[PDB]
Ligand SMILES: NS(=O)(=O)c1ccc(NC(=O)NCCCCO)cc1
């Protein structure tokens with residue numbers, strides 16, 4: 001199966017997922033001088049006060065925190081979006097070194113990691129239907145740079161020892177994802193895709209301008225996870241990011257000047 005190694009990495013994915021070479025693939029480089037300020041873009045509405053986290057899971061390609069998405073408990077609205085999008089999960093992509101790890105880039109700059117808060121459009125009823133629609137998902141992407149610690153990330157970091165290998169999960173209730181946001185909600189937006197197979201072209205991307213800072217100790221804990229399952233040769237879960245894809249016939253819009 002697909003992964004991030006020499007023999008199963010992003011350059012191989014098209015053989016099983018031919019949309020990898022499609023017209024609206026993600027991630028992309030955000031060229032800040034070519035993005036256009038759109039004054040019609042509304043501020044994002046992030047409503048996470050009632051979020052109910054459930055589990056944290058090592059899925060063999062990242063780790064993810066899952067939420068109860070059976071009601072409008074944690075929703076994203078506004079911005080470029082029509083309608084209400086429910087938070088299903090968040091996960092990260094990160095590097096083996098601090099100068100790489102993000103999926104999106106900004107003027108070709110790579111960040112140490114990137115957080116994806118994944119939401120689905122409630123008009124489609126469930127996430128499986130939503131992935132089949134051009135406006136089915138909204139992913140809020142947040143860059144991580146290495147510097148001061150992020151207090152709201154620490155509860156995640158401290159449980160990673162319990163989900164070291166693929167398939168492991170743990171209870172992860174009462175986690176507040178608002179602790180992962182930066183101060184500003186200024187964003188870029190463009191139509192794109194999932195950045196892992198099946199690479200479905202169903203995502204409105206909303207990428208925040210302001211990165212969050214995490215400490216070296218926090219990102220080191222990401223890098224101690226394993227791609228492999230327990231009892232298999234150990235391969236550290238690092239560099240689980242897809243590189244920037246061709247922008248093709250798309251314009252990136254900015255909510256700010
Ligand atoms: N989805 S993908 O990136 O196009 C892909 C799928 C299967 C493979 N298969 C593979 O490498 N098989 C050899 C390993 C089997 C022994 O455990 C590689 C890449």
Ligand SMILES: NS(=O)(=O)c1ccc(NC(=O)NCCCCO)cc1
Nearest residue numbers: 116118127128131139193194195196
């Ligand atoms: N890295 S990313 O672009 O934020 C991303 C987000 C969701 C997913 N997949 C997802 O939500 N799947 C829901 C199950 C699909 C049902 O067939 C894959 C990649």
Ligand SMILES: [Zn+2]
Nearest residue numbers: 091093116195
């Ligand atoms: Zn992702």
